[PDB]
């Protein structure tokens, strides 16, 4: 799970090492709380 496949996919629909490349901001729960 990288949350990127949901982070960078939603823009088209709305028409508007591992340690360093991995972040937690793509979490579904926190994304939902921001969007709701």
């Amino acid at each position: 799970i990288n949350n990127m496949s949901f982070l960078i996919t939603d823009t088209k629909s709305k028409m508007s090492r591992k340690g360093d490349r991995y972040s937690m901001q793509t979490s579904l729960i926190v994304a939902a709380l921001k969007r709701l």
């Binding site: 799970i1 496949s5 949901f6 996919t9 939603d10 629909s13 579904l28 729960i29 939902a32």
Partner: protein
């Protein structure tokens, strides 16, 4: 002193010749020429080794050559095309406004290199050992980098024939795999083919079809004999997905994703055969009766895919799904291959649906509608609702990935009776979990001391259900 006396001193060695030709004097041209030549010598040495190892000369003098090939040429190709994908994929339409605009000959040689690597990988997943991953990765990247439209509209007939023959070989391998899986499932060529398909063919075809569908290359490349080969591929993939076999049990996921990519890429509405007469791209409209009889075709538009059901019938099957309360362990292939296929098919064919173009209606290829999508998504949601607390697996997470494009054309009235019960069962599960937490606060860890495997498993299942649903929730 020259300047103050005004003596003009110039560069003195101005360019005497234009030195213009870009089609020949480019680094990409030279590099791909060398790469294709090296792949050619690799192919000839691999056939020589095939003839020698089975003979007296098992020892191969070409150890240094094969080592250089595997350890240099393949990763170099992979990294180079990953870095410069946009340059080769650019056309008259500009993806990268800075520059680039790869030449037609360069695109031709990209396609030729992909075809040569496909020929090399065909039925040879063992001679390279661990290099099977390298060759399949290079083929994946190359297939993502192909420019099918430009290659077909301008290119050498040899390269076009190689591109057609790659798909023909893929269809033949799929047919061989199904035919030796049927009446052969009880019981080394069959094993070699069954391993080769899983290792290489399904990922390569998946990536190529996904790229073709994304870039709308199906209407330019999948024509006539290419359409016949794609019919064969579709039949083989669907029947492999539907078949009940211990061999296909653990490969049906790759079959499902490949079938979804093929449904997205294919330019003919195979599910809705009755409206195939309006599709100009149809071989059943272009090839005419005499060549369609000369070719291996059922001569009828409906009978092209006898096993694949019609869209309405498959909608009816999906509707009685999640209403009969059928579970993943029982009837798994349907929601493993059919549902991603339906999602991809609808995502492709909504633009061609009459709702996009209400004018000149009933001349459009399909009969798809936003009502079809909302019904499909509701049936999916009922499936996941019924399989929420029991029979959990990565299918919930993968189906959620597949169902994302459908959400764009869903009315908000679904949430009035679908989107609340799912969070209802989530709060019930989470409240139960925090209830046993409020009971046994003291022990909450991963090992096995006092009944904490139950709480760990319930936490994992609720987390996986939350990633089943929350992508749908946020994009709704």
């Amino acid at each position: 002193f020259l300047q103050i006396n005004g003596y003009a001193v110039s560069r003195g060695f101005k360019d005497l010749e234009l030195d213009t030709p870009s089609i020949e004097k480019r680094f990409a041209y030279s590099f791909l020429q060398q790469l294709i030549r090296y792949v050619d010598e690799a192919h000839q040495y691999i056939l020589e080794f095939d003839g020698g190892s089975r003979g007296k000369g098992e020892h191969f003098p070409y150890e240094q050559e094969i080592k250089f090939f595997a350890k240099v040429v393949l990763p170099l190709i992979d990294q180079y095309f990953k870095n410069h994908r946009l340059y080769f994929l650019s056309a008259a339409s500009r993806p990268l406004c800075s520059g680039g605009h790869a030449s037609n000959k360069e695109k031709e040689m990209v396609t030729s290199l992909f075809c040569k690597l496909g020929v090399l990988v065909r039925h040879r997943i063992s001679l390279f050992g661990n290099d099977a991953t390298s060759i399949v990765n290079c083929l994946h990247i190359l297939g993502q980098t192909l420019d099918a439209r430009t290659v077909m509209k301008t290119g050498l007939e040899s390269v076009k024939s190689a591109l057609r023959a790659f798909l023909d070989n893929a269809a033949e391998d799929l047919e061989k795999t199904m035919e030796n899986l049927k009446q052969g499932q009880f019981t080394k060529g069959v094993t070699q083919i069954i391993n080769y398909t899983t290792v290489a063919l399904l990922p390569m075809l998946s990536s190529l079809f996904e790229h073709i569908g994304q870039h709308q290359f199906g209407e330019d490349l999948i024509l006539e004999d290419v359409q016949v080969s794609c019919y064969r591929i579709l039949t083989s993939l669907y029947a492999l997905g539907t078949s009940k076999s211990i061999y296909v049990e653990r490969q049906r996921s790759a079959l499902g994703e490949c079938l979804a990519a093929f449904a997205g890429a294919f330019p003919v509405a195979f599910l809705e055969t009755h409206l195939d007469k309006h599709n100009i791209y149809s071989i059943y409209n272009t090839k005419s009766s005499r060549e369609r009889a000369a070719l291996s075709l059922p001569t009828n538009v409906e009978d092209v895919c006898p096993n694949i059901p019609s869209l309405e019938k498959l909608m009816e099957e999906i509707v009685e799904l999640a209403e009969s309360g059928i579970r993943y362990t029982q009837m798994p292939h349907v929601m493993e291959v059919i549902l991603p296929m339906l999602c991809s098919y609808m995502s492709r064919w909504w633009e061609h649906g009459p709702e996009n173009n209400p004018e000149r209606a009933e001349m459009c290829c399909t009969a798809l509608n936003s009502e079809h999508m909302n019904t499909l998504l509701g049936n999916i949601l009922k499936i996941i609702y019924n399989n929420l607390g029991i029979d959990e697996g990565a299918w919930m997470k993968r189906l959620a990935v597949f169902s994302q494009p459908i959400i764009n054309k869903v009315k908000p009235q679904l949430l009035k009776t679908h989107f609340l019960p799912l969070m209802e069962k989530l709060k019930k599960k989470a409240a139960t979990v925090v209830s046993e937490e409020d009971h046994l606060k003291a022990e909450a860890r991963g090992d096995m001391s006092e009944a904490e495997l139950l709480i760990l498993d319930e936490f994992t299942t609720l987390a996986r259900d939350l990633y089943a649903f929350y992508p749908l929730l946020i994009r709704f």
